[PDB]
């Protein structure tokens, strides 16, 4: 009944049905419905449905954020090690089902929506974050560095996707974990 | 225009409209419309949306085996030539703005959907023949030993899939053909 609860609340059963039905499919009454309130109500945290599309993406672009950030602002770990907290904690958002995660891949196919610039917009600073761990990666003589951190960091949004369909297939910790680790020994060789 | 030939223009107009909408949004209307018949016709050639999807579905599960036959059957080229190909020849697709293969990167996202399991019973007949080229350059010394064909596959499709969405912020042939090069240098460095 708190605002801050409720507005949270209504932007997590949105993003419910984006991941059950497709970004953008949920009416106000729908959610109202999962809620137990007014449609009135829906209507007082989100006045339209574009505001509601755009609050959710946006939660779900600052759940990518997060998973970088708990994995890439530890100081005393070397790239590899990061690189693998990145795709353990994907793996698991996968076996649990997380809304956001599957939301995600699915705004990052979605190349003929109005919605797909804010795709690319937001998700050019998670790059720039990535590319800076490979940069740091290079200085420790952790990797070549006759790559581009840029296209190390594209690169690595391509492991995610790949380990993402294959933990959906199996979805194993176990098996995925050790999927991962050669999927990063092939792409990120050791120095 | 005969049966067999009224339903391939309709399979044609779906995948336009499945483009353009989404592969889950019902299309019989729209096709109708596209196809100057009623909607009716539709339906007699399409009894549920089910019927249309799991069709039009396979038309571009076809189109990506044809793709890479295209770029598989000629059995005297090298690994890299190869990989150019399919490259450049997915480039090409996104800067034409081949329906077929918005639809089947939007399929291979829709991982909570009934119509799925058929993208990933598809995708190993695929994932068999590009794991049997990487078990060839293997062969002819083209590239390292070091990582198993099925793992090369499957970042192949990672590479495809960061290419797809470039290509689409730009639609450059030049750089993205320069762009697709680096990428395969860096995961699949020759000799």
């Known amino acids: 009944l708190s605002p801050e609860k409720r507005k949270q ?3 997590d059963f949105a993003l419910d049905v984006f991941a059950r039905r497709g970004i953008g499919r949920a009416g106000h009454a729908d959610i109202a419905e999962m809620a137990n309130v ?3 109500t829906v209507f007082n945290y989100f006045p339209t449905r574009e505001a509601l599309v755009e609050e959710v993406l946006l ?8 998973l970088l950030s708990e994995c890439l602002d530890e100081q005393d770990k ?3 090690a990061r690189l693998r907290g990145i795709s353990h ?3 698991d958002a996968v076996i649990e089902q997380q809304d956001w995660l599957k939301v995600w891949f699915e705004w990052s196919t979605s190349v003929r929506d109005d919605i797909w610039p804010q795709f690319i917009s937001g998700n050019k600073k998670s790059l720039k974050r990535i590319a800076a761990a490979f940069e740091q990666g290079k200085e420790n003589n952790e990797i070549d560095s006759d790559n581009s951190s840029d296209d190390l960091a594209h690169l690595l949004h391509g492991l995610c996707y790949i380990l993402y369909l294959q933990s959906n297939l199996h979805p194993d910790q ?5 999927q991962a680790e050669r999927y990063i020994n092939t792409l990120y060789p050791a120095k």
Chains 1, 2 share one sequence.
């Open 59 to 66: 939660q779900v672009e600052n759940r990518f954020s997060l």
């Open 89 to 91: 904690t994907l793996i």
């Open 174 to 178: 176990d098996r995925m974990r050790e």
């Open 78 to 80: 070397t790239l590899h």
């Open 9 to 11: 609340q209504l932007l």
């Open 38 to 40: 007014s449609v009135a």
